[PDB]
């Protein structure tokens, strides 16, 4: 659990933004190069607010699979000279299943926080707020709003997105390697 | 980073709970048998909510130091059969400096999450919202509301009570073993 949250905190130091669209706040994980990461719920816009600064949106893809199946994120494409570090090396080719997860949030209703969410088992098929949506990931613990974006993490891996919960039982959509060209 | 973490997750499952007073919800540790501690402004009651149960509080202590001067907690004997697990060895007999320090929230805002606040150091004297107050401990990390009651926490170690802060700057009183009689 400890070297868990080690490699998250390091992660989000490195990695992660706070971002607000029209339809909310949100963590953002930069992937590599201009692309990111943000639940599909966020609904970017054209622009968006990351730490307080007006970036231009280049490019958004909400992603389906193959039978257009919603997966829960929109990759995003920023109007942006820095560069992220690449952390395409710790995205799985497929679903992960850890022991001890760590889920890590970074706004301004949860700044720099972090909760161990313990086992993660690939639960796949959900029903979201009426949306058929595949690659999910489940774990247990009591969830809540805003913390939509947060990153689910283990030592070395980063296992997905969070973007669904209630109570007592969270959902992340999986962030597989191939997603990124 | 990681053996904090570790053993704050541990000592709050054991050791914590979520309690409602009039003046809000706080983050409650419970320190020997009957005795927990929250931070002064809680302002507990002749009852209080413990994990949504109604319970009488027997007894309250306002700390202040021999001149009077505030310490921002204020112990509580709970009407309640079961004993919390001893945890007084793990106070400190002076204020704690630590190089890394985690923060443990406990309520349904933040619902067990914790926070890498990094380098405690001994702030002392502080005028907190009026009120001169000692023993405090300062932490650098962006502070919230609803956050009060937090328990601060290295390896091994509870250094104190969350229980001010503004912006990028948090105070904890720190939680002294000579407290407890
Ligand atoms: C995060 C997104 C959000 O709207 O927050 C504001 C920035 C939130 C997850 C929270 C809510 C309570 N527990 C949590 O973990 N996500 C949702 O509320 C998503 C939104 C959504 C709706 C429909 C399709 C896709 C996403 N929905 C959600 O949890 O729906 C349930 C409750 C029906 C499962
Ligand atoms: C926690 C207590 C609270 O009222 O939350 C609701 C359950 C809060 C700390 C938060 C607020 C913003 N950053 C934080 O870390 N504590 C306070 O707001 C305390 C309350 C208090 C006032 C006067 C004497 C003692 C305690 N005050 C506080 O931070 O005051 C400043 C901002 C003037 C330093």
Chains 1, 2 share one sequence.
């Not at 029903?127 to 805003?146: C, D, E, H, I, V």
Request: proline content about 4%.
């Amino acid at each position: 659990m400890g070297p868990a949250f080690e490699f998250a905190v390091a992660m989000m130091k490195r990695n992660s933004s706070t971002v607000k669209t029209e339809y909310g706040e949100f963590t953002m994980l930069g992937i590599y190069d201009r692309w990111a990461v943000l639940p599909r719920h966020a609904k970017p816009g054209p622009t968006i607010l990351m730490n307080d600064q007006e970036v231009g949106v280049l490019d958004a893809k909400e992603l389906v699979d193959k039978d257009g199946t919603n997966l829960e994120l929109t990759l995003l494409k920023l109007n942006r000279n820095e560069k992220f570090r690449d952390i395409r090396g710790f995205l799985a080719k497929e679903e992960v299943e850890v022991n001890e997860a760590v889920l890590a949030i970074n706004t301004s209703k949860f700044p720099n926080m972090y909760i161990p969410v313990g086992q993660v088992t690939e639960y796949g098929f959900l029903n979201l707020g009426g949306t058929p949506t595949k690659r999910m990931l489940m774990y247990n613990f009591p969830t809540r709003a805003g913390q939509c974006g947060g990153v689910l993490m283990s030592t070395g891996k980063v296992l997905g997105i969070h973007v669904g919960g209630n109570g007592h039982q969270g959902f992340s959509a999986a962030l597989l390697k191939h997603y990124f060209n």
